[PDB]
């Protein structure tokens, strides 16, 4: 059937309706609603947040022609913990391992302040000896063990995000931390060599590092697009709103590559007076803040104890639309750099990476467990 994801963002709630193909996802509809009901990745006003989510499901329904009733929810990398764990289940007869057995051994891991939301297999072990990655259709005489990666989140976040969404008359079939979702926007080589995803949104910037095909660790920083706007507003002595517009229209994150011929007029906040500015002027502010964010990212990587980023950097999210971000980052790092943008029609904006990869995740577990 169809897969419906919901990304409850600080700038906009995003919903994608997709269909699973052998080698991909066919997107058949989207919904997007900007709201002030979400701040810093979390619900700021329940009622307003409910309205936006409800409205977005509506938009997604009308656009896809589907009667959305069940959805997969992405969860931000806040109050999150990643760790290892293993579990084993016993058989009392020769058993050909299928999806149900895998679901059961992982389930046990998903057995106080937090709640396990994702449990993915690193490797499986049949009858205390044969170690394999895919144990399907093979025979076990005694057992099936799993060495899994585990993501858990603070109960308060989970409980409130689900309640808010289910208050719009829909069922949350499953939850997917963005820590696991990003695994899907990376190529096999990136996930192997050791790659870092950086999603710069509005209030939150998220970081997730994958290595040897698996998620190693992740975290989030409270510095992103809004902060870029704030500096612009302060610098050009103009309102937040106007600063937001010039950021989209003339924004550039690399001063040297920023243009001078590009000019625009901005009204002042303290006087009827108006002032002229060049893109290079605007870029002074944008580069400074984006640079800071990246330095914040490097600090996260060190605390996480992750020097060495062999697979390169993948930058995505709404602020990734900013010109000069690739230049800026590669100008301060030796490893490869790229901006990820979903390829499907209608969601070809970096802000859609979370929503679309949430579907990739639902599909992955669909194929794993079925």
Ligand X SMILES: Nc1ncnc2c1ncn2[C@@H]1O[C@H](COP(=O)(O)OP(=O)(O)NP(=O)(O)O)[C@@H](O)[C@H]1O
- Contact residues for Cl ion, defined by CB under 5 A: 86, 88, 184, 356-357, 360
Does 322 participate in binding ligand X (rule CB under 6 A)?
yes
Contacted by 293, from Cl ion, ligand X, Mg ion, none: CB < 5 to 8 Å by type: none
Query: Taking the alpha carbons of 317, 13, 215, 204 in that order, is the dihedral positive or negative?
Result: positive
Does 31 participate in binding ligand X (rule CB under 6 A)?
no
Cα angle 287, 314, 354 (rounded to 5 degrees) comes to 100
Does 227 participate in binding ligand X (rule CB under 6 A)?
no
x/- map, 32-71, Mg ion, by CB under 5 A? ----x-----------------------------------
Alpha-helix residue ranges (DSSP H) falling in 196-235: 225-235
Six token digits for residue 67:
């009667």
SS3 of 70, please?
strand
- The DSSP call for residue 92 is S
If the CB atoms of residues 87 and 206 are measured against Mg ion, the closer one turns out to be: 206
Six token digits for residue 265:
């007029």
Does 201 participate in binding Mg ion (rule CB under 5 A)?
yes
**What part of residues 336-355 is at the interface with ligand X (CB under 6 A)?**
351
Does 283 participate in binding ligand X (rule CB under 6 A)?
no
Q: Which of 102, 150, 202, 236 binds ligand X (CB under 6 A)?
A: 202
> Among 305, 326, 119, 295, which Cα is nearest to 194's?
305
If the CB atoms of residues 9 and 183 are measured against Mg ion, the closer one turns out to be: 9
Does 12 participate in binding ligand X (rule CB under 6 A)?
yes
Question: What strands lie across the sheet with 2-8, from one edge to the other?
Answer: 24-34, 12-21, 2-8, 70-75, 171-177
User: Contact 145/87 with Cβ under 8 angstroms?
Assistant: yes
Binding site for ligand X (CB under 6 A): 9-12, 41, 201-204, 224-226, 244, 247-248, 251, 317-319, 321-322, 351
């Amino acid at each position: 059937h169809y897969y419906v994801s919901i990304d409850i963002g600080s700038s906009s709630v995003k919903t994608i309706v997709g269909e699973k193909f052998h080698n991909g996802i066919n997107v058949i509809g989207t919904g997007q609603t900007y709201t002030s009901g979400i701040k810093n990745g979390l619900i700021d006003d329940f009622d307003i947040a409910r309205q936006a989510i409800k409205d977005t499901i509506k938009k997604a329904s009308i656009a896809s022609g589907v009667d959305i009733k069940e959805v997969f929810l992405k969860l931000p990398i806040i109050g999150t913990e990643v760790y290892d764990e293993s579990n084993e289940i016993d058989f009392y007869e020769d058993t050909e391992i299928n999806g149900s057995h895998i679901e059961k051994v992982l389930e046990g891991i998903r057995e106080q302040e937090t709640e396990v939301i994702n449990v993915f297999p690193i490797r499986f072990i049949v009858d205390k000896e044969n170690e394999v990655s895919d144990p399907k259709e093979l025979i076990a005489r005694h057992s099936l063990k799993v060495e899994a990666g585990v993501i858990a989140i603070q109960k308060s976040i989970l409980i409130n995000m689900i309640k808010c969404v289910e208050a719009c008359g829909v069922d949350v079939l499953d939850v997917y931390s963005d820590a696991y979702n990003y695994g899907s926007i990376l190529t096999a080589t990136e996930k192997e060599l050791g790659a870092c995803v950086i999603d710069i949104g509005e209030d939150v910037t998220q970081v997730a590092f994958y290595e040897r095909g698996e998620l190693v660790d992740a975290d989030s920083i409270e510095m992103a697009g809004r902060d870029i706007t704030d500096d612009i507003a302060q610098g050009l002595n103009t309102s937040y709103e106007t600063a937001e517009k010039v950021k989209h229209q003339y924004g550039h994150a690399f001063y040297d590559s920023a243009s001078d011929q590009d000019i625009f007029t901005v009204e002042q906040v303290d006087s009827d007076e108006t002032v002229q500015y060049t893109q290079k002027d605007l870029s002074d502010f944008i580069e400074a803040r984006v640079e800071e964010i990246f330095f914040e990212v490097f600090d996260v990587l060190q605390d996480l104890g992750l020097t060495k980023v062999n697979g390169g950097f993948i930058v995505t999210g709404g602020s990734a639309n900013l010109l000069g971000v690739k230049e800026l980052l590669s100008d301060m790092v030796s490893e490869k750099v790229r901006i990820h943008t979903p390829s499907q029609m209608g969601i070809r904006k970096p802000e859609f990476s979370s929503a679309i990869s949430t579907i990739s995740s639902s599909i992955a577990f669909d194929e794993l467990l079925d």
